[PDB]
Amino acid sequence: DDEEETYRLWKIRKTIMQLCHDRGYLVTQDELDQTLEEFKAQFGDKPSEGRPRRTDLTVLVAHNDDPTDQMFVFFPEEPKVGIKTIKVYCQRMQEENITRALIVVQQGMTPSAKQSLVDMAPKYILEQFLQQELLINITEHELVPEHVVMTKEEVTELLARYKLRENQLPRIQAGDPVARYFGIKRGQVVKIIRPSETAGRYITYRLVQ
């Protein structure tokens, strides 16, 4: 029971570190490859005993390109997170001056909390993940090809090369599992590199909608 919850927490942490590394936040190799017994050593083996508390699991990371661009990962203790908890995180983000955070929720989020993530979105970007959808890194699955988020300059070069408008690219939904993983917003473009049985390799581009 605690042997199950500690395994879940470890897997979720591993996936979150992989996600942060793929978003380009500075993540050490040691924490990226931390084993289950090392997790038990650092945080504990009886989360029902409060060892760890899920408040202990919180992560803070900084971007490789700018040490002031920082992101939290929060693991709320309550199963169904309400607006009180979002307000607590908003306060903590305001005082630490952190604009991005991921909120990992065990069972869900209340309608009011969902709307509160929308209504603060320009200044503080809060994202919801279920813990279930973090128990496996979907980008390691064999059906999912390599996704690379493009820079604005690279999109301008793309559109200038093929002489096309953004609306002529094929789309990806902002709610797509992989778009959510990379955290890409409307109007960004993701380069996709996939093998092909007739050319050898093929690149395609999707505009987020």
Add this chain to the structure above:
DNA sequence: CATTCGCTCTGCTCCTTCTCCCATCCTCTCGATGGCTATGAGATCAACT
């Protein structure tokens, strides 16, 4: 002043409802559809002078 209570507002199911669609081309035969009589008033303007 820490509840506590009551009241408004989503949003998640489970119906009922309703609207849409159902291979291509070609030949033949057969049935069915298949619509007053007549006398008056009376307005028009084509057309004679």
